Amino acid sequence: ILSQSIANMQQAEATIQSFSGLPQNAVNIQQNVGEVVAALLPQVQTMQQQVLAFAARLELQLTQQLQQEIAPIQTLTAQTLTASQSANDRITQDNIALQRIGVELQATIAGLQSNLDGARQELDSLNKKKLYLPGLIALAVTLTQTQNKVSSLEGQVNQIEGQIQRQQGFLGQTTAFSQQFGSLIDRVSKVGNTISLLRLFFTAALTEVRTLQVD
Amino acid sequence: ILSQSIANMQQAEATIQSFSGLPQNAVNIQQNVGEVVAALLPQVQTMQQQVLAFAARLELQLTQEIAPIQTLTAQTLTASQSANDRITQDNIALQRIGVELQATIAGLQSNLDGARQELDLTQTQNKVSSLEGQVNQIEGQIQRQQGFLGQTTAFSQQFGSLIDRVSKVGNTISLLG
Amino acid sequence: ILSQSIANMQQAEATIQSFSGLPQNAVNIQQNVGEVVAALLPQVQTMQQQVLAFAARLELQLTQQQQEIAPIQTLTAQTLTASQSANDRITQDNIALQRIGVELQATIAGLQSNLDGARQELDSLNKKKLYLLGGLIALAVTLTQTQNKVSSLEGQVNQIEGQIQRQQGFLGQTTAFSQQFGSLIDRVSKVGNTISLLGGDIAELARLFFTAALTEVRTLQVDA
Amino acid sequence: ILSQSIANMQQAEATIQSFSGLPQNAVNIQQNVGEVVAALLPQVQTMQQQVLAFAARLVQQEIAPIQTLTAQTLTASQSANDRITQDNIALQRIGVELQATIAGLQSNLDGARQELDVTLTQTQNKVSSLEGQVNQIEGQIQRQQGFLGQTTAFSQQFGSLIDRVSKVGNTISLLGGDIANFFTAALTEVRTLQVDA
C-alpha cells in the first residue's frame, strides 16, 4: 500500500508534467508534484526501511524474553507525516481553485454557444434559400457575411472547448494524485500511531511490532 | 427528433420533480421545467399538427395559410430559446454551489483526518463521530446536487435539439413565403 | 452516520423510482431500493433503539458495580446479512449497467458511420444534380428517399444519445445510493462487533474487565 | 478551427505519449495518434494553404490536384479516427471489467476487515493483501480513466477537423461543377471555401 501509493503517484507525475498553458494554480500543482516525487517519496521509502529494520530487531528481543532507538524513527515518521500533509493540503486548495475556474469557463461558453446558434440558424436559412434557388444575386453577400459570422463564433468557442478539455484532463490527474497521496498519509499516520503505542508486557508490544511489520 | 425531444423532455421532468430540499436555483428550474412540460410543449405539439396539415394541403395542389403558422412557429422558437437560456444560467449557478460544497467537505474532511488519526477517550470519539456525520451530510447534498444537475443538463440539451428542429421548420416556412 | 445515511437513502429513493423505460438491470435495483427503504431501514432503526436502550441500562449498572445480549446481537447479525445481500445485488446490477453503457457507445459509433455514409450519398446525388443543370425531375424522388434516410439515422443517433444520458444519470443515482448503503453496513458491523467484545469482556481482575465493558458500552452509544 | 483543431490535437498527444505500462489497446492509440500528428496534420496545413492561395484567384487544372489532396487527407483522417474510436470502446470494456474484479475482491475484504474489527496476524496478512490487491486495481482504473479522458478529447477534436475538411472537400466539388458548366455560383462557392479555412 505504501509502495503502490508511491508507484502510482510516480506514474501520474510525468502525465502531470505533460500539460502546458494551464492556469497558475495548475503550475503550482505541477511544481508541488515534482518536489514530492523527487524529494518526499524517497524520504518515505527511507522511513519504511528504517521501520522494517527497527521492527526486525525488536521482534526477536521480544520472542527471546518470553526505546533509545525509537526516538530518531519517531522524529522521521512525524516529519514525513507533516510534510506529506502540507504538500497534499497545497494540492487540495489548488484543485478547488481549478474547479471554480472550470465552472467560469462554462458560463463564458454559454454566451459563445448561444450567440453561435443565432448565426448557425441564420446561415441554415440562407443555405436553404441558396440550395432551392436574380434571387441568387440578392442572397450572395449576406450568405458570405453570415458564413463569416458563424466560423468566427465557432473559432472562439472551439478555443474555449480546448481550454475546458485540457483543464478537466489535468484535474482528473491531480485529483487521482491526491486520492493516492491520501492513501499514503493514512498509512504513514498509521505507522506513526504504532511507533507511539510502543509476559503480558512483551506480548502486547510484540503485536505492536507485528502490526508495524505488516503496515 | 421533435417527437423524440418532447418525450425525453417529459421523462427528465418527472426525475427533476422528485428531488426535495434543494437550493434556490434548483427550485427555479423545477418550476421552469413543469412550465415547459405543461404548456410550452403542447404549443410545440399543436404547431406540429398545423404545420403538417399546411404541409399536406400544398402537397395535393402541387400533385393565406403561411402567416398564421410562421407566427406560431417563430413565437414557439423564441419562447423555447428564452426558457432554455434561463435554465442554462441556473445550471451554472448550481455548479458554483456544487464547487462550494467541494470546498466545505474539504474543510470538514481535514478536521476529521485530524481527529480520526488521533482516534487511532469519549472526547475524541464524539468529536470524530460528529465530523463523520457532518461530512456524510455534505456528501449526501453533493450527490443529490450532481444528480439534479445531471437531469437539468440532460433536460436543457434535449430542449436545444427541439430548438434546432423548430428553428429548421421555421426556415422552410420562411422560404415558402 | 447510521441515521444520516438512512435519510440520504430515503431522499434518493423517490428519484430512483422516477425513471421509466430502463433495462431490466435498472428495474431490479428500483425494486431493491424499494424494499430497502420499506423493510430494512425501519429494522435498522429498531436495532438502533434496542441497542441504545440496552447500552443505557448496562452503562449505569457498570459505573455502579448476557440474557439481553442474545436477542439484540441476532437482530444485529440479521440486519448486517440482509443489508449486505441487498447491497451485493446493487453492485452486480450496476456493473451490468456499466457494460450496457459501453455497448451503447458501440451502437452510436455504428449509427454514426452509417449516418456519414448517407450524408455522402446525398452529396453524391447533388453532384449528379450539377450535371443535370446542363430528368432533374426524376432525381427529386430519389433526393427525398435519401433526404428521408439521413433524417432517419439522425433520429436513431438522437434516440441512443437520450438512452445513454438517461442510463448514466441512473448510474449516478444508484452508485450514490450504494455509496451511502456501504456507510450503513460499516456502522452496523461496527455495532455488532462491539456487542461481541462486550459479551467477551462481560463473560480484582473484575474491576478491570468491568471498566473495559464500560469502554465498549460508551462506544456502542457513540456509534448508534 | 483548422489550426485550433491541430493545436489541440498536438497538446493532447504529448500527454497521451506520457502514459506508460498501459494495456495494448492503450499502446495502439499511442502509436496511432503520434502518426496523426506527424503525418495527417502537416498535409492538413499544406491543403489549407493551397486551398487559400487557390481561392483568391485552366482552372480544372488548378482544382484537380487540390480536390484529390483534400479527398485523400479526409479518407486517411476517417480511418485513423475510426480505429481510435474502437480502441476507445475496447479500453472502456477493459475499464468496466476492472470495476468487476474489485466487485468480487472487495466483498471478501469487507469480510476480513470486519473480522479484524496467531489470531491478529492471520487476519492482518489477508487484509494486507486483499487491501493491496484492491488498491492496485484502483490505480489502473485511474490511469485508464485518465487515458480515455484524453484519447476521447483527441478523438472529438479530430472529429471537428474531419468534418470541416469534409465541408471544404464538398465545396471544391461544387465549385468544379459550377466552373465546368454559374460564374455567380462558382463565386459564392469560392467565398465559402475562403471562410472554411
Numbering used by the authors:
A (entry chain P): 5 to 70, 89 to 155, 164 to 228, 248 to 264
B (entry chain R): 5 to 67, 90 to 146, 173 to 229
C (entry chain S): 5 to 69, 89 to 157, 165 to 233, 245 to 265
D (entry chain Q): 5 to 61, 87 to 146, 171 to 234, 250 to 265
Sentences from the paper on this structure:
We show that the orthologue identified in A. hydrophila (AhlABC) is a haemolytic tripartite α-PFT, requiring all three components for maximal lysis, and we present the structures of the soluble forms of monomeric AhlB and tetrameric AhlC and the decameric pore form of AhlB. AhlC provides the initial single leaflet insertion, assembly with AhlB then producing an oligomeric hydrophobic pore, and finally recruitment of AhlA produces a hydrophilic fully active AhlABC pore. Structural and sequence analysis suggests this method of pore assembly may well occur throughout the tripartite α-PFT family.
In this second crystal form the head domains of subunit Q and S do not form crystal contacts and the electron density for these areas is poor, indicating that these hydrophobic head domains are flexible within the tetramer. Flexibility of the head to disassociate from the tetramer when presented with a hydrophobic surface is also shown in the crystals of AhlC, where the α3–α4 hydrophobic heads of two subunits protrude from the tetramer to pack against equivalent regions of symmetry related molecules in one crystal form and make no contacts and are disordered in the other. However, the AhC subunits of the soluble tetramer adopt a pore type conformation with the hydrophobic heads buried within the tail domains of symmetry related subunits. To determine if disassembly of the tetramer is required for membrane binding, we cross-linked soluble AhlC with glutaraldehyde to produce equal proportions of AhlC monomer and AhlC dimer, whereas when AhlC was cross-linked with both glutaraldehyde and 1-ethyl-3-(3-dimethylaminopropyl)carbodiimide, the dimeric species was formed exclusively. Haemolytic assays using these cross-linked samples showed that lysis was abolished for the purely dimeric form and reduced by about 50% for the mixture of monomeric and dimeric AhlC.
